[PDB]
Design a protein around this ligand. Structure first.
Ligand SMILES: [Mg+2]
Ligand SMILES: [Zn+2]
Ligand SMILES: [Zn+2]
Lengths: 103, 211, 55, 64, 83, 118
C-alpha cells in the first residue's frame, strides 16, 4: 500500500518461530502484498558457565548453560491496517512479534 | 524504556521462575502442577494447572482474584494487564509434581512410607506411565539416614530422550525428625497425538511394516 | 540522631550491596544479563529461566 | 557498668504549670512564649532554658 | 512497634482497599512502593496482623505476600471506622 | 434522653476519632481553635486544674459540660478495654475529653447541642 512495515520476531525456539514466520509470509502472499523475508539474523548465544558444586570440594566441573535467541525480520510495504490484520493470528508462545512502521 | 532482546528473554525466564516458586509455596495443598505464561497483546494471560481447581479459585473466585492482583502489583503489570486462569491437569498420574505433592501430604499425615510410595507407584502405572520410580531419602526409621528406591516398569536414564520422556520432581517433607526427600521420576509413553507423552518415538525403537 | 548512623555507610557498590534475588546471599552472584541469581540458585532454576545444556 | 537509658523526666501536670489563670477575673496569662513557627500552634510552648528559648516540637531557639 | 496512627491507618486502608499486600525483605527501603510508609513498618505491622490471624503470609524469592483473611475484613472495617 | 444519655455521641466521636483527652492536650485542642465541647469531672482534687481549664474555655467560646465520676469519664472516652460484655475494664480516670472535630454521626449531638446552647 503506502508505508513500509518491519515485523521483528524473536524466540527461544526455532520451530515455533519458523512456523509463525511461515504463517506471516503466507498471509502476506495471499493478500498480494510484496514480502521481503523471512530474514534470519545471527543467532544470539547467551552463555552461563558455573561450577556445578554448591561448595568448593571435588573436581572443579563446569556446566555450560546456553539460551539461543533467534531473530527474524519481515519487511512488507503496506498500510498499518493490513499489518495488524495479518499479525492477529495465533502467535505461538515464546514468539515476540514486534511491528514498526517505516516511511 | 528500550530493553535489549537479551535482557528481555532473561527477564521473562526469571519472571517465570519466580512466579512458579510463589505459586508452589502458595498453591501448595491445591495440587499445583505448573504455570503456563502466555503473553497475549491485550494482557499476559497466566494459566495455572492444579488438581484442586476449586481450592485455588476460592469462594466465588476470591483467591484467584487476590493472586491476580498480587501478581499485577508485585511484577508491575499495567492494571488489567494480567489475568490468572486455572485449568485442570488432565492426567495427574503422569505428572511427577502432582504425585510428589500427593506423596508429600500422604507422609505429612503419618502414613507409612513403604505403603504410600507403592500407592503412588500403583496410581502412576494405572494412569499409564511406561515406568515409574520413587526415592525416599532421610531419617526414615532410625537416626542414620538411608534411601529406599521404589521402581517398577521401564525407565531410561541417559541421552537426550530423557528430557523428553522422563517427567521428574523433587520435593521435601518437613517432618519432626528432619527433612525427607522425594524424587519421583515418571517415564512417559510415546503418544502419536502428543498429549499423554512425547510425540517422537524413542530413537532405538524400530518398526517394520508387515508384508 | 540514630537514623543518620543506621545504614549510614554507602551501598552504591560492593558485593555487600547486591544479593541473590532468590535467597539474599551475596556470594557467587551471577550479574550477567541481569540475572541477579547466585551460582547455586541459578543452577537450580536454570531450566525455568530457560538455559539449556547442550555441551 | 551498663550505660543506663535516658528516662523521660516526669513533671506532674506541666500544663497546670504553664498558664497563669488566677487573681479571679479571666487571664489565661501564658508563662512561656508560644513558638512562632506556623505549623507549631499557639499551645506549643517554647521552653526557656538558663539562656535559650527552645521549641520542643521543632528546634527554633533564642539565647540571651 | 511504634507506628504513628497516620501510617497505621495508611497501611490498613490500602489492605482493606485491595485485600492483599506485598513487600521485599528490605528493612531500610524508607518507602513502600505503594503505601507512603517505609517497608519496615509495613512488614512489622503485617507480621502483627498475622499473629492475630488477620492475614495469611507467604514468603517467596525475598518478597513477602500477605492476604487479608475473613477475620481481617472484620477487624479492618471495625478499625477504619467505616465499611 | 439528655446529659448522661449523651455519652453515645461521644462514643461515635471516639469511633470516628476526635477525642482529645487529657489537659496537656485539652489546652492545645482549645488554642488550636478546634475544641467544640469539653466534658469535665469535678472529682479532680487539685483546684488549679478546674480553674485553669475553665479559664481556657472562657478565653475561647466552645462549651463546658460537667459530669461526675472521673472513672466514668474514662469509661466514656475509651480510656479502657471493652473486656467482656460485663466490661471488667481497668479504667483510667479522665478529667478532660475535648471533642475536637466531634463525631459527625449527629443524632443526640443535636439534643446535647441544645443543652450546649443552654
Ligand atoms: Mg551415550
Ligand atoms: Zn541464592
Ligand atoms: Zn516549633
Amino acid at each position: 500500500v503506502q508505508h513500509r512495515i518491519r515485523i521483528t520476531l524473536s524466540s527461544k525456539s526455532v520451530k515455533n518461530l519458523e512456523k509463525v514466520c511461515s504463517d506471516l509470509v503466507k498471509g502476506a502472499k495471499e493478500k498480494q502484498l510484496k514480502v521481503k523475508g523471512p530474514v534470519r539474523m545471527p543467532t544470539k548465544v547467551l552463555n552461563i558457565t558455573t561450577r556445578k558444586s554448591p561448595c568448593g570440594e571435588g573436581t572443579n566441573t563446569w556446566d555450560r548453560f546456553e539460551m539461543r535467541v533467534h531473530k527474524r525480520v519481515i519487511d512488507l510495504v503496506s498500510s498499518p491496517d493490513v499489518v495488524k490484520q495479518i499479525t492477529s493470528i495465533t502467535i505461538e508462545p515464546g514468539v515476540e512479534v514486534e511491528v514498526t512502521i517505516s516511511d | 524504556t528500550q530493553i535489549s532482546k537479551k535482557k528481555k528473554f532473561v527477564s521473562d525466564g526469571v519472571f517465570y521462575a519466580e512466579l512458579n516458586e510463589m505459586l508452589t509455596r502458595e498453591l501448595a495443598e491445591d495440587g499445583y502442577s505448573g504455570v503456563e505464561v502466555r503473553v497475549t497483546p491485550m494482557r499476559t494471560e497466566i494459566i495455572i494447572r492444579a488438581t484442586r481447581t476449586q481450592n485455588v479459585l476460592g469462594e466465588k473466585g476470591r483467591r484467584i482474584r487476590e493472586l491476580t492482583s498480587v501478581v499485577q502489583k508485585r511484577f508491575n503489570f499495567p492494571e488489567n494487564g494480567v489475568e490468572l486462569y486455572a485449568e485442570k491437569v488432565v492426567n495427574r498420574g503422569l505428572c511427577a509434581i502432582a504425585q510428589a505433592e500427593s506423596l508429600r501430604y500422604k507422609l505429612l499425615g503419618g502414613l507409612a512410607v513403604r505403603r504410600a510410595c507403592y500407592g503412588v507407584l500403583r496410581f502412576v502405572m494405572e494412569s499409564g506411565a511406561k515406568g515409574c520410580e520413587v526415592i525416599v531419602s532421610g531419617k526414615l526409621r532410625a537416626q542414620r539416614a538411608k534411601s529406599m528406591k521404589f521402581k517398577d516398569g521401564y525407565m531410561i536414564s541417559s541421552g537426550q530422550p530423557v528430557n523428553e520422556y522422563i517427567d521428574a520432581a523433587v520435593r521435601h517433607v518437613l517432618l519432626r525428625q528432619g527433612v525427607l526427600g522425594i524424587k519421583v521420576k515418571i517415564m512417559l509413553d510415546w503418544d502419536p497425538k502428543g498429549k499423554l507423552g512425547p510425540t517422537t518415538p524413542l530413537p532405538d525403537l524400530v518398526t517394520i511394516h508387515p508384508p | 540522631g540514630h537514623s543518620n548512623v543506621w545504614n549510614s555507610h554507602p551501598k552504591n557498590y560492593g558485593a555487600g550491596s547486591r544479593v541473590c534475588r532468590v535467597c539474599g546471599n551475596s556470594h557467587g552472584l551471577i550479574r550477567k544479563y541481569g540475572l541477579m541469581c547466585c551460582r547455586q540458585c541459578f543452577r537450580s532454576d536454570a531450566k525455568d529461566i530457560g538455559f539449556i545444556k547442550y555441551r | 557498668p551498663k550505660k543506663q537509658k535516658h528516662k523521660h523526666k516526669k513533671v506532674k501536670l506541666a500544663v497546670l504549670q504553664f498558664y497563669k489563670v488566677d487573681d479571679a477575673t479571666g487571664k489565661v496569662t501564658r508563662l512561656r512564649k508560644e513558638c512562632p513557627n506556623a505549623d507549631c500552634g499557639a499551645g506549643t510552648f517554647m521552653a526557656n532554658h538558663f539562656d535559650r528559648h527552645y521549641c520542643g516540637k521543632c528546634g527554633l531557639t533564642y539565647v540571651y | 512497634m511504634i507506628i504513628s496512627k497516620k501510617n497505621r491507618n495508611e497501611i490498613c486502608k490500602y489492605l482493606f482497599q485491595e485485600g492483599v499486600l506485598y513487600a521485599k525483605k528490605d528493612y531500610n527501603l524508607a518507602k513502600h512502593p505503594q503505601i507512603d510508609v517505609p517497608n519496615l513498618q509495613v512488614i512489622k505491622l503485617m507480621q502483627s496482623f498475622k499473629s492475630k490471624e488477620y492475614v495469611r503470609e507467604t514468603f517467596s524469592w525475598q518478597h513477602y505476600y500477605w492476604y487479608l483473611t475473613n477475620d481481617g475484613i472484620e477487624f479492618l472495617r471495625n478499625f477504619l471506622n467505616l465499611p | 434522653d439528655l446529659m448522661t444519655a449523651l455519652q453515645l455521641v461521644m462514643k461515635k466521636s471516639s469511633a470516628h476519632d476526635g477525642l482529645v483527652k487529657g489537659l496537656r492536650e485539652a489546652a492545645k485542642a482549645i488554642e488550636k481553635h478546634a475544641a467544640q465541647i469539653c466534658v469535665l469531672a469535678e472529682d479532680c482534687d487539685q483546684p488549679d486544674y478546674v480553674k485553669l481549664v475553665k479559664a481556657l474555655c472562657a478565653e475561647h467560646n466552645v462549651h463546658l459540660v460537667t459530669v461526675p465520676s472521673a472513672k466514668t469519664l474514662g469509661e466514656w472516652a475509651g480510656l479502657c478495654k471493652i473486656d467482656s460484655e460485663g466490661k471488667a475494664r481497668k479504667v483510667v480516670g479522665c478529667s478532660c475529653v475535648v471533642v475536637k472535630d466531634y463525631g459527625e454521626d449527629s443524632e443526640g449531638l443535636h439534643i446535647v447541642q441544645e443543652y450546649v446552647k443552654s
